[PDB]
Amino acid sequence: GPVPSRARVYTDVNTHRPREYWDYESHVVEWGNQDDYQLVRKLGRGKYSEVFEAINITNNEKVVVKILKPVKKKKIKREIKILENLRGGPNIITLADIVKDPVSRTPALVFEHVNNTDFKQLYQTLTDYDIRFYMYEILKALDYCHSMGIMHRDVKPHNVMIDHEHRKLRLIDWGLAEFYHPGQEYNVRVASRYFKGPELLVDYQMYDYSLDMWSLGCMLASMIFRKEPFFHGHDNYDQLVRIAKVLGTEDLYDYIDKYNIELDPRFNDILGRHSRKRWERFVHSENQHLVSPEALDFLDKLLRYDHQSRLTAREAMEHPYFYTVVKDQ
C-alpha cells in the first residue's frame, strides 16, 4: 500500500480549530436576499460560473456577483465556508453575501468591490521586478489560507487577477478549495492540466498545501521563460512526460519508490529515461532579462517531485529572490 504523507507546516491547524470551523457539511448557509443586488453588466464568463458587475441597492455600493454552476450542494457549502473563514485575509477576495433564486434557485456569490481598482487577469507582459512583486503577493494569499488550514488546489494565472496601476492582487475562484486534515485522502481531479503536481498525475491522494506550491512554480517558469504553458501536456500521462523531460526521470522514480506509489504497467514503460535538463537551456535572447541566479534557484526549490521537499509559502517569502522586494514593502 501507499505510504502516508503529512504536511510539514500547518499540519494540525484544523485539529486545533472547533469542529464548526471546517465541518462544512454541518454548516447552515445563511442565505441573503437576491432583491438587494441588481446586475449592472457582465464582466467575464465560463462553464462553471457567470460573473457580473452589480450594485447593492440597499447601500448603493458596487459589488461583484458570481452565479455558480449547478454544482453539488455539498461543494456549495464548502466554498462558502472557506470564503467566510478567509475573510479579511491578504490578497483574498471578500465574500459580502450569498443569495439565490435568480433563475430557478441558483446559488450566487456576492464579493466586495474595491473602489477605483480595475482588476484584470494575470498575463505575461511583466518586467523582472513585477514578476517578483506579484509572486510575493500570491505567496501572501497562499500562506494565509494554508495557515488557515485550507488548500486552494487551482492555482493558475486565470485565477489570479491584477491591478497594475495600484499594485493590487487577488487570488480568486475558490470552488476547488478544501480543508486539510492529516491522513485524509483527497480527490486528484483538481487544478488544470498544466498546473497539476506530480502527486495528482500519479494518483497519490494524500497530498497537502504543497500542491499549490507546484502550481505556483509552473506559473513562475512560464513567466520568466516566456513560455505558456511551461509543461504543455495533451493528456494527464503526457503532462508527467513533459515534466520528466525537464526534471529528469531519476528523481521521479525515487519519488514513486518512496511513497510506494503503484503506477499502471504501461505508464512506467512509456515514461522511460530522461536526463534533468538545465533551467538555463530555456533561457533565450528574449527572456534573458527575467532570468537571474535567484530566479532559477527559487524555481528549482518549487518544482520538486517530492511535495514534502518543496518550499512552503513562507520559506518562499524568505528566499533571496524576493530580497529587494520585501525591503520595498
Ligand SMILES: Cc1ccc(-c2csc3ncnc(SCCC(=O)O)c23)cc1
Ligand atoms: C476584488 C475583487 C472582486 C471580485 C473579483 C472577481 C472574482 S471572480 C471575477 N471574475 C471577473 N472579474 C472579477 S473582478 C472585475 C473588476 C472589478 O469590478 O473588480 C472577479 C476579483 C477581485
Ligand SMILES: [Cl-]
Ligand atoms: Cl490559466
Ligand SMILES: [Cl-]
Ligand atoms: Cl471567484
Ligand SMILES: [Cl-]
Ligand atoms: Cl477532495
Ligand SMILES: [Cl-]
Ligand atoms: Cl512542454
Ligand SMILES: [Cl-]
Ligand atoms: Cl505553505
